[PDB]
Write a protein that binds this ligand. Structure first.
Ligand SMILES: Nc1ncnc2c1ncn2[C@@H]1O[C@H](COP(=O)(O)OP(=O)(O)NP(=O)(O)O)[C@@H](O)[C@H]1O
Length: 313
């Protein structure tokens, strides 16, 4: 039905996750054999919340980056919206933290630099994420982080990660990254309560426990990021070459995209052109329209496949 058009292009596997808006299914793009994750949303059930989806969709169409979960295909039927995404099988950063209880400062730095790369890129494109937290960061096959859930992108979110100025746009993401840092290094939240009023007061207050295993450097960074006054809160740029961030690193954080679509891959175009019964020139013209239809998705998945193969060649 709504699924019949989808099943032209994908064969559906099991549900692998859910959220407040979407049921997420593993699937396989038939033409290329590539696995993907499909967000399924019901328009009728979403109702007045639907703009969030069109928000996420328009955001993701203009974001392309190593640490951003890629959007391949958008499909609307009478009752459903389907978003076909890069499959990340490593699960959430959340579950990883719980598995390790807490991360070492060193592995925290490795993770944090990737988060920072993604968020700095997102800002470079004029957005703020507004829902940064370990649940919205997924591990891919190579244990690399991929940011998801862009429905709150603005050109808001879980309270424990929400900045003070926002519960009464760049500075906010910085705050949330501070909370995330704390969580990675500590295994728990700095501001936590079952009572929302209590939690709120704790946040506006800005006082948190500082455990013995933490380095002075990281303690400082935290206090720079968890400044209740956004005016006093550290800026993205200064986060990008902050000494804690740069510790044991001769490289500043490369937030710039490593995956821009500069120009069309010949092999991929060729492969598409055969299946499409059109010349390569024609296919080039078509692909450049970037409609996020089946053509777009096939092209990008062929590209991802090729990259994966080139990594083992
Ligand atoms: N690309 C993906 N690869 C693997 N698992 C995914 C992927 N996208 C989502 N998931 C899983 O599905 C869950 C729900 O995704 P999510 O995008 O947060 O749903 P949502 O309803 O649209 N947003 P939210 O209600 O705020 O969580 C995630 O927490 C993951 O467990």
């Amino acid at each position: 039905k709504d699924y019949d058009e989808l099943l032209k292009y994908y064969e559906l596997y099991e549900t692998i996750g859910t959220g407040g808006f979407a049921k997420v299914k593993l699937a396989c793009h038939v033409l290329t054999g590539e696995m993907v994750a499909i967000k399924i949303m019901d328009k009728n059930a979403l109702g007045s919340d639907l703009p969030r989806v069109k928000t996420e969709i328009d955001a993701l169409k203009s974001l392309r980056h190593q640490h951003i979960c890629q959007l391949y295909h958008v499909l609307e039927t009478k009752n459903k919206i389907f978003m076909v995404l890069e499959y990340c099988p490593g699960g959430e950063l959340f579950d990883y933290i719980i598995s390790q209880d807490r991360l070492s400062e060193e592995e925290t730095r490795v993770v944090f630099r990737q988060i920072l790369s993604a968020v700095a890129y997102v800002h470079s494109q004029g957005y703020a994420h507004r829902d940064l937290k370990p649940e919205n960061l997924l591990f891919d096959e190579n244990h690399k982080l991929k940011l998801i859930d862009f429905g709150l992108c603005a050109k808001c979110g879980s309270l424990a990660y929400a900045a003070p100025e926002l519960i009464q746009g760049s500075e906010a993401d910085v705050w949330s990254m501070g909370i995330l840092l704390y969580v990675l290094m500590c295994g728990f939240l700095p501001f936590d309560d079952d009572n929302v009023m209590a939690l709120y007061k704790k946040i506006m207050r800005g006082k948190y426990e500082v455990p013995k295993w933490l380095s002075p450097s990281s303690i400082l960074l935290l206090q720079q990021m968890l400044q209740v006054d956004p005016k006093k809160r550290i800026s993205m740029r200064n986060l990008l070459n902050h000494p804690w961030v740069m510790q044991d690193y001769s490289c500043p954080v490369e937030w710039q995209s490593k995956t821009p679509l500069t120009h069309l891959d010949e092999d991929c175009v060729t492969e598409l052109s055969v299946h499409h019964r059109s010349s390569r020139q024609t296919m080039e013209d078509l692909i450049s329209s970037w409609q996020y239809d089946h053509l777009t998705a096939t092209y990008l998945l062929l590209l991802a496949k090729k990259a994966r193969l080139e990594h083992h060649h």
